Amino acid sequence: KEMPQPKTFGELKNLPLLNTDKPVQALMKIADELGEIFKFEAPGRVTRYLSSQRLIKEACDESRFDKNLSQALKFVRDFAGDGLATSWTHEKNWKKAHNILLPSFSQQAMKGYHAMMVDIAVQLVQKWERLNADEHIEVPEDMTRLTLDTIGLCGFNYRFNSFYRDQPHPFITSMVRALDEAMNKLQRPAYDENKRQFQEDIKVMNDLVDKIIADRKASGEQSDDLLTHMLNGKDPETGEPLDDENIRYQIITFLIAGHETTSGLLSFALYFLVKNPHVLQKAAEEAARVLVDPVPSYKQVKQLKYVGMVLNEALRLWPTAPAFSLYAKEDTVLGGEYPLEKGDELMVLIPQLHRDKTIWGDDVEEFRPERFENPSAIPQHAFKPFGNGQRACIGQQFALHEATLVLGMMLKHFDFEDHTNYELDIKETLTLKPEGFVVKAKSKKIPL
Amino acid sequence: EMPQPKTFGELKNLPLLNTDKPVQALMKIADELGEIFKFEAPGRVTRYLSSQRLIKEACDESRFDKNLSQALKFVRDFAGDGLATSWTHEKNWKKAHNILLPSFSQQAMKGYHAMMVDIAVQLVQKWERLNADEHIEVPEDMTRLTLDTIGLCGFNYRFNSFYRDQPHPFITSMVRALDEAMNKLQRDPAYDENKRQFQEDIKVMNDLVDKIIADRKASGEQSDDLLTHMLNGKDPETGEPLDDENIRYQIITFLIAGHETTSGLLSFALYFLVKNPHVLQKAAEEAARVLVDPVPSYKQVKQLKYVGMVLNEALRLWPTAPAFSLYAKEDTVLGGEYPLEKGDELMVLIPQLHRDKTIWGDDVEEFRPERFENPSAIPQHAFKPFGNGQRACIGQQFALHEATLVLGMMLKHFDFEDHTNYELDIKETLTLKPEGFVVKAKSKKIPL
Ligand code: HEM
Ligand code: HEM
């Protein structure tokens, strides 16, 4: 009835608790102490962090709760606009882009993106084949090169050529710095350079994306990318297409929402695999049995069943988009004891949800991909790495196809060594990643 | 060049349908021949469609319109120009369609809810009153439920099927009329007894329905049933009401189109639940959490999300109205390789469509309600248990609200045992049902 709350700081209430370098991990420790729900107050803001499947299964009732833009998403909106991830459900452009973009993100549409994904994945494999002895791999750095390039190619047929670079393409530098400024605004006349740099980074992103859209319309060429689908698609409901400004925001959104979540997933999966050599061996055995051709086919990726469980278990422990926000559509009572008023906000703390011992058992911290043999045995709403309902991740099939393809090829082509006995250190941006995770790869000498 | 199954001399393909399980026979042929095969008989040519690729074109209403299959033409002899057995271009179709659409909407189910509960409570009470190690004949009791529910919701008439071993004479004549209609497909001076009985059964249906209509008009009483709506409704287009003869045909149509499709759905769903105990446990948890009152409310039924998923996945594997028919409005080319002339007929083999691995993946034979967790993931025209377009099932919301309500109460009030390890055996009439499916129910002793 009375809702737990962590320690306060006078007038600032709970807010200084998030003035820390690892706020998600800080919130998980608070959840460890306070339980399934706690109130978090700041000046002009109240939200409630949910950690149990019991309460989150109610929060996922779309007749009772809708997606809220967290403060993070509101700051990302300044450059993602009314793209899918930073628009309200009630904004006309959300349902429009949702209806238009859903068929180009289907499992069936991944057949058409597969060749481009293979293109970047082969570049990653070739980079590792070309390392000299006792050189090593910087895992999140290379995974981020892979996912950024893959989304650039599948999104708007543009090659960032990240594997030809130390310093990323200017668009990426601006995007990364823009996200950083957005995240720095949370824990926040000396900011004049930050704002000037922020407007400057927005213009870099807008200019490049608007140019490619204009170039594509001028040329009239048709590609197998999201940009072509968006130039030609019409919303069945309104009968309208997306305008060029929103198409730009969707492209920027794909790059923001997709690249770091997906690269963090690959990075966490490889980390858990090298820390669990029996699991790695099982995944590598599947990769060798299934990937019989020099280039994986779309059909073979779907056959990487255990690799898929590996990725789901990595998403269980470290969901790389670690929270989402909801608001009550009407007055309602949560869990039979917490009354909420219309508009009241909730935060779903996904990594805590995925450690609910009433759901997963006492070994919640162990990496066991076998937990995902049967999705029917998993209770409703216990596993939410891609969000919920009509506001769930539209790029889920994309991300899992990319991650399964790349992890499969990595496991086919290399043995991995945790040569530093790497100590897990999770860096927090808007996503989570194992900072400083490094491995050595010894090639199995299998040609491409 | 179009594939075709084996022939029988002058009879061509027709004897292939001289079997007790013709839908399942056609599914096996589709397994061998692929997405389309020609089926020839004396004076008849049709083509059976099984792939989403081709059916999504057949469902283009600018190119194809609903055709009356030979089954529907035989049903028309007692369903008249009711909605299901009338051509789109017949005045009475659009007329009745316009009048009846508002009384079948989701909003209209609020008015039928009390009557549906009345019969559902009778079903629960019957099972609460079984003795130990007595058992349930599932499709038999489901059919008692759906017939009585349609009788009460349709024209405020109580068949009182739960007070009977031998059904009300109207039901006996109706079932025998449908049996004669289906037996005519597979079909001599010896058939003289058959038509005399058919005409007797037609008269039985007409007399009872005409009497109830006449009684209601004489009384002037108003009920929450479809009959009241039809005596008072006026088509906005023609400004006309339905006449008494057509009102009769609609009532007969609701009983034909609704009762065994819906009871087969309930029966198949319970079969899959007892065969998939993890699914049953998840559905039973939702039912216990949602149905907190002794009588389910309309709002609570809408909250049975996973029960709805169970029903959709049961409809995916065994769509109980297993086909519908179309004709080309003009000369057209199907799939880029099959030219069709004006008037050419197509049959949509729904159970095959629902097994199209290009849409659903390789696990098409597994019962996994989680496929329907997010309705956004289903491609267009991949899932068509209720037909297509303006000729789709008008009773879809009725059927799903009834099935959700009843299954929810069944799962709330009883644990179920597959005490015979029942082996699926699908009986085919105009619809599909699991013949001989029996269970034991152990009450949870929750009062009504
Ligand atoms: C492992 C990788 C990924 C994870 C964990 C992930 C996670 C999520 C989550 C949790 C949400 C819901 C956020 C909210 O409710 O506020 C979301 C939404 C979204 N994601 Fe992903 N994502 C991943 C990959 C991708 C990719 C590759 C793309 C694009 C190609 C993408 C595009 C989107 C979009 C557009 C939305 C908003 C959809 C809408 O609201 O209509 N994501 N994602
Ligand atoms: C699970 C249960 C049901 C299923 C699977 C089902 C399926 C279908 C299908 C596939 C059609 C299209 C047939 C064609 O195109 O030739 C149809 C039409 C129709 N159904 Fe249903 N049905 C169900 C329940 C009901 C109920 C409960 C009612 C009445 C209360 C009903 C009344 C009708 C009517 C009137 C039509 C013809 C509509 C028109 O053409 O204007 N059905 N149904």
Q: Which two tokens stand for residue B169?
A: 């004479």
Among chain A residues, the shortest Cα distance to B300 is held by: A63
Instruction: Compute CA distances B3 → B33, B332, B385, whole Å.
Output: 6, 19, 26
Q: Which atom of ligand 1 is nearest to the CA of A226?
A: 30
Q: Would the CA dihedral through A122, A123, A129, A133 be positive or negative?
A: negative
| B303 contact A CB<8A | yes
Q: Which residues of B touch A379 (CB under 8 A)?
A: 282, 285
Q: Which two tokens stand for residue B243?
A: 């006449």
Give dist(CA A401, CA A105) in Å, integer. Answer: 11
Which of B17-24's residues contact partners 24+ apart within 8 Å by CB, and which partners? B17/B185, B17/B186, B18/B186, B19/B186, B20/B427, B20/B428, B21/B426, B21/B428, B22/B185, B22/B186, B22/B428, B23/B322, B23/B323, B23/B349, B23/B351, B23/B428, B23/B432, B24/B426, B24/B428
Give dist(CA B448, CA B446) in Å, integer. Answer: 7
Compute CA B140 distance to the chain's CA centroid, rounded to the nearest angstrom: 15
A114 contact partners, CB below 8 Å, separation of at least 6: A297, A298, A301, A401, A405
Amino acid identity of A43? P
Give dist(CA B140, CA B28) in Å, integer. Answer: 28
The single residue of B262, B367, B393, B404 carrying the catalytic annotation is: B393
B348 touches B328 (CB < 8 A): no
Obtained via which technique? Answer: X-ray
| B272 contact A CB<8A | no
Cα dihedral angle (A286, A289, A293, A298), rounded to 10 degrees? -50
Compute CA A149 distance to the chain's CA centroid, rounded to the nearest angstrom: 15
Q: Pairing state of beta strands A345-349 and A45-50?
A: parallel
B138 touches B437 (CB < 8 A): yes
The count of domains in chain B is 1
| A228 contact B CB<8A | no
Give the residues after which the backbone of chain B is interrupted, taking a C-to-next-N distance over 2.5 angstroms as a break: 187
A342 contact partners, CB below 8 Å, separation of at least 6: A328, A329, A330, A331
Host H or E run for residue A280:
helix A277-290
Q: Which residues of B touch A390 (CB under 8 A)?
A: 374, 376
Give dist(CA B384, CA B377) in Å, integer. Answer: 15
Q: B308, B294, B221, B230: which is closest to B265 by C-alpha?
A: B308
A104 contact partners, CB below 8 Å, separation of at least 6: A226, A229, A230, A233
Instruction: Compute CA distances A50 → A37, A347, A362, whole Å.
Output: 5, 6, 20
Q: Which two tokens stand for residue A445?
A: 């000498």
**N- to C-terminal Cα separation, chain A:** 61
- Looking at the complex, report in whole angstroms how far the Cα of residue A301 sits from the nearest Cα belonging to chain B: 12
Give dist(CA B181, CA B192) in Å, integer. Answer: 15
Among chain A residues, the shortest Cα distance to B380 is held by: A103
Distance B392 CA to ligand 2 centre (A): 7
Give dist(CA B216, CA A100) in Å, integer. Answer: 50
Is B393 assigned a catalytic role? yes
Give dist(CA A317, CA B69) in Å, integer. Answer: 55
The single residue of B268, B386, B416, B437 carrying the catalytic annotation is: B386
Q: Would the CA dihedral through B434, B440, B445, B448 be positive or negative?
A: positive
Q: Pairing state of beta strands B345-349 and B44-49?
A: parallel
Compute CA B389 distance to the chain's CA centroid, rounded to the nearest angstrom: 16
Q: Which residues of A359-378 are buried (b: 16+ CB within 10 A; e: fewer)?
A: bbeeebeebbbebbeeebeb
Quickly count: other Cβ atoms within 10 Å of residue B186's Cβ: 12
Q: Which residues of A292-313 are buried (b: 16+ CB within 10 A; e: fewer)?
A: eeeebbbebbbbbebbbbbbbb
| Angle, CA of B279, B280 and B283, to the nearest 5° | 85
| Strand ranges, E, within A332-380 | 332-334, 338-340, 345-349
Catalytic residues of A: 261, 386, 393
Interface test with A, best of B274, B374, B378, B380 (most A CBs within 10 A): B374
Give me the domain span that covers residue A28: 1-448
A97 touches A391 (CB < 8 A): no
Ligand 2: residues within 6 Å at CB? Answer: B 66, 83-84, 97, 150, 253-254, 257-258, 261-262, 265, 319-321, 324, 385-387, 391, 393-395, 398-399
A316 pocket-lining for ligand 1 (C-beta < 6 Å): no
Q: Pairing state of beta strands B323-328 and B64-67?
A: antiparallel
How much of chain B is helix, strand and coil, in % rounded to 5? 55, 10, 35
Q: Which residues of A touch B106 (CB under 8 A)?
A: none
A254 touches A146 (CB < 8 A): no
- Looking at the complex, report in whole angstroms how far the Cα of residue B396 sits from the nearest Cα belonging to chain A: 21
DSSP state of B20: S
Q: A316, A319, A399, A387: which is closest to A70 by C-alpha?
A: A387
B161 touches B259 (CB < 8 A): no
Give dist(CA B22, CA B28) in Å, integer. Answer: 10
**Resolution in A, one decimal?**
2.0
Q: Which residues of A touch B306 (CB under 8 A)?
A: 380
Residue B187: exposure state from Cβ atoms within 10 A (0-12, 13-18, ≥19): exposed
Q: Which two tokens stand for residue B264?
A: 């087969």
**Helix B244-275 and helix B138-155, axial crossing angle in degrees, nearest 10:** 150
A67 pocket-lining for ligand 1 (C-beta < 6 Å): yes
Quickly count: other Cβ atoms within 10 Å of residue B422's Cβ: 16
Give dist(CA B202, CA B225) in Å, integer. Answer: 23
Interface test with B, best of A371, A376, A383, A390 (most B CBs within 10 A): A376
